[PDB]
Design a protein around this ligand. Structure first.
Ligand SMILES: [Fe+3]
Lengths: 211, 197
């Protein structure tokens, strides 16, 4: 999904609000901030109502201006609440009645997702690969800066996981595939407009093809 | 327009979500309280510091950590949510590694702790992939141009920790003493461990 959450490479932001080893305060800076992760865990592992990938996608689905003005932990309060309504567990009426006011949610999904690709290749360390030049409107774990770009495999995972473009929509056909650490030169991703050296992206097999 | 939607206070919304689920019996007794304590107390960068100090002083452990991080971390019992498949990436005199999750906030929770607000900021997520030398400089860490910066974007299930270089001035220090200088920011990769001056 080419949403505003795909921030890598965007220009115009100011300083990172930190200097190294500064005091960052307590883990939680308000008494409610442990609730989105804990209730997410409840939803995934106790209720089996959704996957972690569905939580990433429902936050991606926040209306773009709403995403941009909402603090991190609050995005996940909104996301988990949205999934609980979509999955028929909660209603928006009871959330708003208990909250005593408006509780707008993420926007509905405009894509049914896609299955794990049937044709993929098993790459080896050192091979050159290109990120498939594909556009996916639903969830995908490919940041656009690497779409269509070429890099080199530095690692193939020894474990395998469901394809996010499927499981992030609750689909039954996510299969399992390994992922690959793909090393890109900075200039391959940003031309002359970068000060870095290399970037490594951890890409599912189904996002890649031989170069 | 382009104004924010009207919304009840976020505390009211978060507890409303809790009460709506809890009152349907969908949240086990002590469940969020238990994870809050785990998040606050057990998931900690003091763990990744322990791992770095061990790697620094034990070549065999260093080798395991760099070839099978998962197995190395599991020897300590520190695998967990957001930290089930671990890769440790090694700094060298010509390579500085830095970690980000440009798409959200993915972090090796059990050994780095939950990510800090700044790592989840749109500033860090947008900028460190493209201009990490400037970002680190602004943050207080100068990386000489004779050193490649490599940014790892945490886009799938691998969860990373940086193994920073051991600074001079620490020869013969104990595990304990070494651990003290490996901070959360060193494990993320935006800081270099410092020896008192
Ligand atoms: Fe993330």
């Amino acid at each position: 999904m080419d949403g505003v959450h795909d921030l890598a490479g965007v220009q115009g932001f100011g300083k990172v609000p930190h200097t190294v080893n500064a005091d960052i305060g307590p883990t939680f800076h308000a008494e409610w901030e442990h609730l989105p992760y804990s209730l997410m865990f409840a939803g995934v592992a106790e209720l089996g109502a959704f996957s972690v990938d569905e939580v990433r996608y429902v936050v991606e689905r926040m209306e773009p201006r709403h995403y941009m003005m909402t603090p991190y932990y609050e995005r996940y309060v909104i996301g988990v609440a949205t999934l609980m309504v979509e999955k028929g567990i909660l209603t928006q009426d009871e959330l708003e009645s208990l909250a005593g006011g408006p509780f707008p949610l993420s926007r509905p999904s405009e894509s049914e997702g896609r299955p794990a690709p049937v044709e993929t290749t098993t790459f080896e360390v050192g091979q050159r690969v290109r990120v498939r030049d594909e556009y996916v409107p639903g969830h995908i774990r490919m940041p656009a800066y690497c779409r269509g770009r070429v890099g080199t495999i530095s690692h193939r995972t020894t474990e395998k996981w469901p394809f996010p473009d499927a499981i992030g929509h609750g689909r039954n056909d996510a299969g399992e595939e390994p992922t690959y650490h793909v090393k890109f030169a900075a200039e391959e991703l940003f031309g002359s407009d970068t000060d870095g050296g290399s970037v490594v992206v951890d890409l599912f097999e189904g996002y890649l093809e031989p170069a | 327009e382009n104004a924010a939607p009207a919304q009840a206070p976020v505390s009211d919304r978060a507890w409303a979500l809790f009460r709506a689920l809890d009152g349907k019996g969908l949240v086990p007794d002590g469940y969020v309280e238990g994870w809050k304590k785990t998040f606050e107390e057990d998931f900690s960068p003091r763990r990744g510091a322990e791992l770095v100090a061990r790697a620094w002083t034990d070549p065999e452990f260093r080798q395991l950590l760099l070839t099978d991080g998962t197995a190395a971390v599991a020897q300590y019992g520190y695998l967990g949510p957001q930290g089930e498949y671990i890769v440790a990436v090694e700094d060298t005199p010509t390579l500085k590694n830095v970690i980000v999750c440009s798409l959200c906030s993915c972090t090796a929770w059990p050994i780095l702790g939950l990510p800090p607000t700044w790592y989840k900021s749109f500033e860090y997520r947008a900028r460190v992939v493209r201009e990490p030398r400037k970002v680190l400089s602004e943050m207080g860490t100068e990386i000489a141009s004779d050193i490649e910066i490599r940014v790892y974007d945490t886009t799938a299930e691998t969860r990373y920790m940086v193994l920073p270089q051991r600074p001079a001035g620490t020869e013969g220090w104990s595990q304990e003493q070494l651990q003290e200088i490996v901070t959360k920011d060193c494990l993320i990769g935006v800081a270099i461990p410092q020896v008192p001056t």
